[PDB]
Amino acid sequence: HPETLVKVKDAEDQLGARVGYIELDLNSGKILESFRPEERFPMMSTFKVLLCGAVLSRVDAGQEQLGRRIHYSQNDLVEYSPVTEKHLTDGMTVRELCSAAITMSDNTAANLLLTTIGGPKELTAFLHNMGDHVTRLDRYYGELNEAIPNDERDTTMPAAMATTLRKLLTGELLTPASRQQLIDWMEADKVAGPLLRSALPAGWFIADKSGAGERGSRGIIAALGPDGKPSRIVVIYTTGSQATMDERNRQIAEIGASLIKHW
Length: 263
Prior knowledge:
Elements: H1 2-15, E1 18-25, E2 31-35, E3 41-42, H2 47-60, E4 69-70, E5 92-93, H3 94-103, H4 107-117, H5 120-129, E6 155-156, H6 158-170, H7 176-187, E7 205-212, E8 218-225, E9 232-239, H8 245-261
Antiparallel strand pairs: 1-2, 1-9, 3-6, 4-5, 7-8, 8-9
Helix pairs in contact: 1-8, 2-4, 2-7, 3-4
Keywords: Antibiotic resistance, Disulfide bond, Hydrolase, Plasmid, Signal, Transposable element
Binding site for substrate: 209-211
EC number: 3.5.2.6
């Protein structure tokens, strides 16, 4: 994808930052194009799809129920909890929490779900067991941040994330009902408008999950395709930029425009 590669390198120039990129054939798993595929990037909230995949594996095993209600308190609430802050007395069901984590990127929802699966170390072990020996989650939201140079915690690599997302969405790990639920949550993503969705023509399918973080981090993982059916996985990460969120958004959208134009 010569033009898209040019645009990815342009984005590094514009942002003064690293950009990692991969296009993966959804059906075959073949890497169609990549840039920095085996470099680490902060996952940010894109991990929340993997989290809910682990939750769904427990549901499939009969060890979790999507309808199970979890109660929590003010003390559980961390920064950016737009859905969970509304239900301190209601509690929320496991499916409501995964909906909040994926579609709104609610951080308390993610923490609560992490607890159900045994925490970050257990998510990492889940990933390792499905053949992703790179992606790692280490911390809950709200934990003390060390500010470590080239911090390896809570990171993935574009190729690993793309491969892992394909396994979760189409592989045999989850039941088809659970695969469908996971992609349905991603399709209902509410907070990724200015990224790939902004470049998406009418009639296209997209299921995605966005991320942002300090130090200029911004990213998106997606399954998308024309005619209302996904056919490709796209993963885009950037970190290190001093640019505003708008500027990072625009570069990702422009990579998206290139992806679409040269589909």
